[PDB]
């Protein structure tokens, strides 16, 4: 329910729980 920190717009989310909510990834 917060930002993962990384971005999926470049390559992809690092954490498996982080969804590709372009541009930034989010988890929980």
Summarize the structure.
This protein is mainly β and 28 residues long.
Our count of helices gives 0
Structural class: mainly beta
Main β-sheet: number of strands, strand sense, barrel status? 3 strands, antiparallel
The H/E string reads EEE
Strand order of the largest sheet: 1-3-2
Specify Rg, calculated over alpha carbons. 7 Å
Keywords: Disulfide bond, Knottin, Plant defense
Protein name: Kalata-B12
Function: Probably participates in a plant defense mechanism.
Cross-link (Cyclopeptide (Gly-Asp)): 1-28
Mind explaining what this structure looks like?
- Disulfide bonds join 4-18, 8-20, 13-25.
- Keywords: Disulfide bond, Knottin, Plant defense.
- One of its GO terms (biological process) is defense response.
- Belongs to the cyclotide family. Moebius subfamily.
- This is Kalata-B12.
- This protein is an all-beta fold.
- It has one domain (1-28).
- 0% of the residues lie in helices and 43% in strands.
- It is built from no helices and three strands.
- The chain has strands spanning 2-7, 18-19, 24-27.
- A three-stranded antiparallel sheet has the order 1-3-2, with no helix packed on it.
- The radius of gyration is 7 Å and the shape is globular.
């Amino acid at each position: 329910g917060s930002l993962c920190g990384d971005t999926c717009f470049v390559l992809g989310c690092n954490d498996s729980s982080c969804s590709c909510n372009y541009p930034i990834c989010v988890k929980d």
